[PDB]
Amino acid sequence: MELSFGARAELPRIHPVASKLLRLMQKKETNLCLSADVSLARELLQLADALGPSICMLKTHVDILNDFTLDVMKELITLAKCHEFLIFEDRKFADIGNTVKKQYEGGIFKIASWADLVNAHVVPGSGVVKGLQEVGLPLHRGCLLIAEMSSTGSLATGDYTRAAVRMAEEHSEFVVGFISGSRVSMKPEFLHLTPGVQLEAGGDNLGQQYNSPQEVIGKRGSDIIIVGRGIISAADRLEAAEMYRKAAWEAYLSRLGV
Template sequence: MAAPMNNMRMSLEDLIIRLYDVQAVKFGTFKLKSGIESPVYIDLRVIVSYPEILVRVSEYLWDASQNCSNNFKSLCGVPYTALPLATCIATKHHMPMLIRRKEAKDYGTKRMIEGHYEPGERCLVVEDVVTSGSSVLETAQALKTADIDVRDAVVLLDREQGGAQMLKSEGIHLHSVCTLSKMLDVLQTSERLSGPDIERVREFIAENKFNAMSGIKRNGSGDTHCSHKKAKKVHNYADRASLCTNPVSKQLLQIMETKKSNLAVSADLTSCGEVLELVNRVGPHVCLVKTHVDILEDFTPEFTKRLTELAQKHNFLIFEDRKFADIGSTVLNQYSGGMYRISDWANITNAHSVPGEGVIQGLKQVGLSKNRACVLIAEMSSTGNLAKGDYSSATVKMAEEHSDFVIGFICQSRLTSDPSLLHMTPGVQLTEGQDSLGQNYITPTEVITNRGSDIIIVGRGITKATDPAEAARQYQEAGYRAYLAQFE
């Protein structure tokens, strides 16, 4: 049976000590998901097993929310650690609560935000720990997509590594209960930590500060950290364009620089009219339009003519997602002939490397003279796929050996440091999750900033949106912001 709750309010100092005692805060040497070693590890999920601590933390968060200059009508906890905290606040103070889903249901309302709300209402975001602020921002973006206004966020612990500044640059004011420096002071005074341990953590914090232009790494608990290793040089789009010898990769990077966009829309609709209408609406926000021409039920050559005209109008390239996977002589004919004549209108196509180099040679024989290019499928986003490990390594080697025609990869993360090779990642939405058919979704921040990819490929997040143009704008901004975050 749980111990009865003490009615006297727990001081912040006592709360910090209790968090340490239940190992919600640990000090030592911890390898994070990013591979770097950290002297401090914070995991507040454990407090759900300590009701008294859970309640006290929620009360301090509520107190911090009273400093908000903007009147909020509801609150939303960042999934998943902050959900019980938000629930405690909501029940104690009779405050309406919203829940942000990490994935949409494939039945019912299919909503990403659960709960009752009015368009334009103001919502307070609740979080446990902030390092970069990216988790708060992702929740805020999901709320804003549902026409919910976010101006403030409350957090128990600010690690003082730049998260508050980043959120401020996005128009969100962070109100923290405690800083990591305060926590260190309390633990040193209470003799929980020694002087050398304190200095290790302070040094780590100082070396891992970042701003809106710095790189971010994510650890296993959902917290984020900047790598304290010396970062490799990140080339901007314009510099990379100057390093490319293939005219397609050069043009694509120039478009990305000019339009400030790393967004590719996957126009997977089944009628020509629907595709053309969608492309005309989202065209100003994208660098690539990806098609599956063989799913069109009313295809005629007029479709590709009009698509090419839209590409010129809105300054984007066309990527036919054909996934060639046969011997060279067969793909040569599939690429150049048939009813689709892909090589005549698609700037880029793609291929599996399973058949070996012959598939590249067959495509190259047609495409090279037409200033076309190919990307190889090195990794996939579906559950249980076999494109990984040795397969991915062999695919990279093939690309490097055919760099006159192969300009990059379909992948889940950066596979090579060669700045002339582009990395394109599908399965991107503003919130993480999985659909009913095993498609895994990851966020623009995870794809571009954390995994080092170059282009986000978005399908249903745009095609199923009520306003595809507005959705494309949001993805464009999120993707470009994630790109900027790679630079010191």
């Protein structure tokens, strides 16, 4: 009952955003999401171009860009289209519906205009999702709910995690999956994306914890690895990206039996 990415893309209950993603993952043999945590647009675009072929998704923090403009986003979309990857803004919407609606649609970033995917914390209750949903957009858009976090002392456990899953299942018209450390939903239509990934054991000095692709994808049953520093801080970024891609891909293959 474990299905390939390509098969999952065709599930009756699949969201169009999820389908698109799943299809390209299968085509490109990648379940790697690059976390492009950089300070300059030039670097963001360089990464997108060089590593585009190796990734299913590019995760942005547009607020960390010193020189964000929508023109930058236009260029990013072009690369996304070229290389075939989704854009995920790691916005972490985390307030009342009325506020997040505005934060998604409007303001300086105009996130909804370019981000295939965003994420939200579940702490405010389901209003956080409802608010995001109320943004009118004749484009295919999805949301990921933060069900678990990668950091030491995370409170996104137990009943909290269950709450996230329930909220997702109840808003499946928009919510396409999770940020989690493992498989949290038994429903194959939902994507699992996992940050806190490096080839080596460890962490950082500010509460990040790392697990390997084999652990996260293979043992813990997640779908996609999110990797920042493991790539962007590497001596050879393309080489690193390819290692991560191959690691995650093989780990995934291991679940498909035969």
